[PDB]
Symmetry: D2
Subunit: 292 residues, 4 copies
């Protein structure tokens, strides 16, 4: 095949996908933006040269990010997303019947406009009256406003030094900006980077341990995302408990979410939060904490 | 970082590993045989241009291939391996104290002799008095010998038309050749190809469904193998039940297996054997059966 | 710099060009047709996954293909092009004031229509009253029409077994079909494939030797084409001598050709027609003759 | 094919060769050193990630670099090489019957040792009593010693800012270090980088113009080197004339060089020094000069 997008995932690992076209290439002051039409994963959003969403498997990422957090809440009504410009986290949140307000707070208007325009899947979401789009740094936005939320969702890029996301994974940020803005019984969830057998030590274990230092209950979980070329991680965090069985998750899904989930049922969530021996022990032994 | 090993996982997806060296390249009349020293995965055995074992994570594959089968057996004493010339399957079998004899039946003497010399991790295994190496087609060997086994392990390449491995995945094979050479309570396990969200439809679902036509109890399961760049699958099959808890499995590990498993504990197996919603249902609805 | 067009020049040599866009991809039943906007070479026409014309250097190929033949002719008035659907060969022919008619005979109407729409450099050429476009196999066309030409231009793909172009490079073709349709003093020129130090043995030496069996005077010549990643070759053939000095050629350029050539002057042609020691001798000693 | 060496030749152009092995990888304080066994070009020396010599076509580079300069001299006896660690420039120089002394002055002992050991072709050269190996910066070595030479050969890497070679292409270096150390009737030749239709403006035109400002007679010439993925350039420079015909070159070769040249005869040299229209005009119009 002639045409390829190439991504260096580590300094010694490259991942190449065959291309149909290069649909749109924008840029803002924040990052490079690109929509590719790829053979293996369909349409793909690439930010600063990292694939961040692919048409074929974004559903897995977005179901996993969103649904566990809301299903463990007794009655989630309002939710604040840090990031979300791609719009699929909002789509999945808006599937919940209890939800009356979703704030998408992304720093990059152009990403939003771009995806608002070209990720057709998210059109019903982007137009729902419950969605409020806010163009800001989520950290500034959070400390600015007094509104408190049932659920806060971190749908940011991994914490990389000198980037616009690193701040929002520090113990400082959690303790003093995020957690004050959680209602009673509030639940936080953040995307947490690679969660492979070896790749999980880069950011996942540290995000987990950083949250461990702020919240009473912390639940790491993971699932394969083919377009990310790895197992990916999320962490639920709360000062209230987080224990539903699979059966109780399935009941809650059937009652509270419109239409059928495609990836996530209760058993899948139970498998997801049962990390492997080595990962589970690695996380437990982690002592690094993100800080100022 | 300018020398790379490349593998086309699909016709539109390439995975590239930075190389330190090319330790050996060659061929038997069956297959090309190469050993690469890679940066991300250490020494990697590449057979017909497909990476089959990487030093850093082969433990995952071989622990998943071997331990669930033997652990589910009350008392496995004799095992036959279809393929296994690389030696790691034998290695993990020989960690079981209950085992008295392992037959490794590989068609290609050069794989065996090459791995016996170059894959040092398996040196003790290859030299264990309990191991018998037979150089033959596994199907011809099983047909021509009356010996029966407590466990038979399929460590062959994926089934396709016309390759030397296809006929060892058929309904007629399992029924007429393999099952008669299982002892009372015998367990079969085979590797079963990619088991990703979409890639599982190639062979994993068909192997599962084929086995489902021959054995009463069939347990498919899967785990990520980074050097294979996908979730990989295995299938257990038996005419006796295959239902142990994570705790039962741990006790058995502790009683029967020399040293600590690096990948697999009881929980990890339960997680591996709980497939995602989509994969589970796809397997259940599969109707392809491999036949002669 | 993460999207790339790749071409395997040989089974062990790849050339990759950074892409701006994929402007079109598709196919007729003859060939795939793609137009890529490349960084190093501008818009590149790719036919069956082989780059055939790049905006930045196609002038070299087409100047070398066309001008030496016409310049050596006392008075070329009518020309037939075998292939030429891309339009650049016609373009450079039509710069000659002496020309009254060009027949462009391409087998693939979709190449013609595509290039006529998308390769703007050739718009005037395509619209010139002197140009006739015929959609046919060039061999069938020449056989079935009595018209004779002062020059015939071979602008076909390289000869191999079974492709649509092979039979237009054979001894029997040149003798029985082409030569009878040359006027008195007629000159044949064909593109002749790679002409590198080693790559010239594939087809360039064989075309030269084949022509040497049919025509009295045969002048092979070559020039670097960066976007082809090699030296490329052409062969002039005639029953009348082909021996002009660099100065004679310049005077003719000045008298007959509208505008300045960007690549070819008289000296450049003399240089191109002086092959290296090794290539010269290899051509002289070649004995393969293409036959039906 | 599985294993590749990748070279970025421009920011938008990559060149990939299939690999047999990575024979040796050294490093010194000056550069990275590597010997690859490549499929398309055989054994290849790579310095700081740039291929600098390949077994299959180094003869072209080294014949072109060496023989024109000596053949234009009436009686060259002693020669100083700036660089030469690879040893092939010395090999070709030592083929001349008039030559009694060759100084190989390379800054990197390890390159020399490495090639002394592993480039078998140059064994007779490296052991010839006329060869003096000197481990130094050629600029310091030149200004240090009083010996004057009939021919000085620049076999350095292209002039790249902040590298150890840039100094040795400045007008200052030429005027005040190099030219004082040329005997009466002395001839200088330097390798001069890419000499393609467009690539020649990077260093070739500037090296040419810089020498033009120091020497009375300057002759640029070029030839394709497949392993360099380009036409490559050299420049002869002298205060005496440089005009032999092809015929006079061939006589001189037959009388003065042992054995047959494989690439270069008199006609080849004449073709080589007949640049194309555009290159010839580009060089003539160059006004940039390398300086302090
Ligand atoms: N794994 C999937 C991750 C998705 S890509 C990261 C997303 O979060 C936004 N973003 C980056 N920094 C941000 C900040 N400080 N505040 C709000 N949004 C931000 C960015 O514009 C982009 O939409
Ligand atoms: N990922 C797990 C695959 C590892 S590679 C496939 C292995 O099975 C052998 N093999 C192939 N066909 C065979 C046959 N009919 N009988 C015995 N061994 C065979 C082959 O020689 C090789 O060692
Ligand atoms: N580098 C110079 C090659 C350019 S690409 C080859 C061109 O010759 C046409 N073509 C192929 N076979 C043909 C035939 N038998 N008759 C007429 N045109 C033909 C084909 O449609 C295409 O336009
Ligand atoms: N196109 C083919 C070029 C060959 S590669 C450049 C060669 O010139 C040496 N070299 C680099 N800088 C040098 C200096 N200042 N003095 C002497 N040798 C040097 C370097 O160690 C190497 O052997």
């Amino acid at each position: 095949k002639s045409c390829w997008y190439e991504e260096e995932i580590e300094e010694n690992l490259r991942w190449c996908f065959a291309l149909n076209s290069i649909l749109h290439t924008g840029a803002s002051q924040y990052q490079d933006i690109a929509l590719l039409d790829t053979k293996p994963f369909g349409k793909a959003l690439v930010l600063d040269g990292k694939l961040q969403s692919a048409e074929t498997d974004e559903f897995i990422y977005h179901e996993c990010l969103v649904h566990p957090a809301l299903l463990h809440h007794p009655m989630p009504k309002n939710v604040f997303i840090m990031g979300g410009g791609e719009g699929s986290t909002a789509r999945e949140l808006l599937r919940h019947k209890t939800i009356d307000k979703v704030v998408m707070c992304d720093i990059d208007e152009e990403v939003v406009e771009f995806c608002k325009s070209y990720l057709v899947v998210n059109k019903e979401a982007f137009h729902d009256s419950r969605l409020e789009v806010v163009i800001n740094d989520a950290k500034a936005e959070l400390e600015g406003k007094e509104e408190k939320y049932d659920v806060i969702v971190g749908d940011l890029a991994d914490p990389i030094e000198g980037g616009p996301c690193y701040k929002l994974y520090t113990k400082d940020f959690y303790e003093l900006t995020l957690k004050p803005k959680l209602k009673k019984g509030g639940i936080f969830v953040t995307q947490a980077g690679p969660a492979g057998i070896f790749s999980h030590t880069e950011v996942f274990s540290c995000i987990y341990n950083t949250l461990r230092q702020v919240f009473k209950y912390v639940v790491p979980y993971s699932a394969h995302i083919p377009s990310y070329a790895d197992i990916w991680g999320w962490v639920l965090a709360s000062d209230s408990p987080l224990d539903l069985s699979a059966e109780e998750l399935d009941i809650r899904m059937r009652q509270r979410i419109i239409e059928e989930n495609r990836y996530l049922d209760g058993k899948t969530f139970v498998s997801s939060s049962t990390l492997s021996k080595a990962v589970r022990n690695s996380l437990n032994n982690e002592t690094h904490v993100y800080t100022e």
